[PDB]
Amino acid sequence: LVVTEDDCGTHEGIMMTPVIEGGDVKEPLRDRVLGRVTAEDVLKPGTADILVPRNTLLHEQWCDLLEENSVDAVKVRSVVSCDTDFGVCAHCYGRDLARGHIINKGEAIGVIAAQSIGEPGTQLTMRTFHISSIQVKNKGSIKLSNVKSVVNSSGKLVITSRNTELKLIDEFGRTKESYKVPYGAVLAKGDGEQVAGGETVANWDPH
Amino acid sequence: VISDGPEAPHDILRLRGVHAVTRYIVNEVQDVYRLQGVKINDKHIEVIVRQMLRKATIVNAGSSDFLEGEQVEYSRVKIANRELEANGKVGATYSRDLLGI
Amino acid sequence: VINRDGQEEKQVSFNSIYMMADSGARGSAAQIRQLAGMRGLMAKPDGSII
Amino acid sequence: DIVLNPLGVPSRMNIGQILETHLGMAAKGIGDKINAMLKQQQEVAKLREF
């Protein structure tokens, strides 16, 4: 794989959000979107106006500017979605290099990818050494997503679906806390209210 | 989830789609690496994944000369049946295939 | 524990190995712990902890 | 004679080299006292007692 042509014109891309495995954020969105070309128009949540266009390389300035607006669902161009035949377009790759500018027309990127994965291979290990409920960390608002709910005898909202997700929406509108709530959990809250920092939002028996 | 246990990436692609399976692979390998504290950008695994899915199996030949169960690389059938789609003749349908490295 | 225009105060230690550990030059918390304190627990070839 | 790197000590966790260094320093101090006794030749008595 090389940089055969600069562009192909594909509008396909991937959505980027701060990664959360069901606890706190383990890597910010700025680490995952920096140095990549946007894949779509950029708007505030209420379509105030277009902040960034569809082809601006998101370098440090634009990363900070997005940090000001704080929208955290960013469609960005990727290598897999590239329309280029028998090669990769320079825009869908991104800009990363030892140098800070965009990738040059011709650099062999697949070999560099393989070496980049290979260097941490030494730091790994062939054989391993030996090996109740949700506690919110920051202060925010409960947002129940993909969940069926029912009011039990006590009045506490209980969950009747397995795919239940729980988000913490703060006063800006971002999502820093995401959790997966099992079926048959107890929620003293529901979708729409506000909770304190460290306040227990929901409990269930682990077994 | 119709049951539990780890899943096979080929079926993950076959049901959810391309972006889902590449997201799964990059996220899982990022977890494994991040546990040992090695920073690696998602781009390299992106390009590895693009080269992993390069092959795809034809489903319907249509107006093409492909075989009903032939496995050809995505880009080749892409350009061919795309020129036939720009033409009047009906194109050929395919299904993305996941091949190990 | 040191005195400055006064009786006593305390600060981050100037001990050599602690500087080598905190600065990130050479070492981490575990190695310093093992040079000084009781050293954890191992396992038999089966993996069963001692 | 030699200038070693102290940083090589904590990361590699071989403190026995430091004990060997201290004990060799001590033994050489004993030998230097003995050589001083040799040059300022006193007698069999003082050397034997030492």
Binding site: Q123, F129, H130, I131 | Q36 | S28, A30, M42 | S11, M13
Partner: peptide, 21 residues
């Protein structure tokens, strides 16, 4: 401990793992 050149067999479970010199 750190500065990965040999692994640390001795640790409480859950730590990433050294990777010690």
């Amino acid at each position: 401990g750190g500065a990965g050149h040999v692994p640390e067999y001795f640790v409480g479970i859950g730590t990433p793992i050294s990777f010690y010199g």
